[PDB]
Amino acid sequence: NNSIAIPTNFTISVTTEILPVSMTKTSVDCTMYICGDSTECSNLLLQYG
Amino acid sequence: NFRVQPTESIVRFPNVTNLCPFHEVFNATRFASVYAWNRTRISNCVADY
Numbered sequence A: 001n002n003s004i005a006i007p008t009n010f011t012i013s014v015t016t017e018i019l020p021v022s023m024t025k026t027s028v029d030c031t032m033y034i035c036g037d038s039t040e041c042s043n044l045l046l047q048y049g
Numbered sequence B: 001n002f003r004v005q006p007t008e009s010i011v012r013f014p015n016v017t018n019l020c021p022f023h024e025v026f027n028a029t030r031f032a033s034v035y036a037w038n039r040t041r042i043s044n045c046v047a048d049y
Helices: A030-034 A040-048
Strands: none
Touching: A030 A040
8 A cells, every 4th residue: 555666776778679661572574474485375365354 | 575586596306316227228239029028127216208
């Protein structure tokens, strides 16, 4: 009911916090992946919208 | 996007593989008795006709 605890010294503490901010920005060559660089396959691919 | 390029290089598996018994029947001096048809089993190849 009537007792309190009070610091008498202190401590400076440095902690770290690692955060991800950005990730690798890729791009894809939709045809060259799907259809292979050099193919009338690509000519079929454009059918797919 | 961007790329195409043609130039055909078709360097091939063989180098100097043996031809065949060809140019040996087409160019033989003495053939067989007719019923003893001189079938062989023409050899390994490059029988590139």
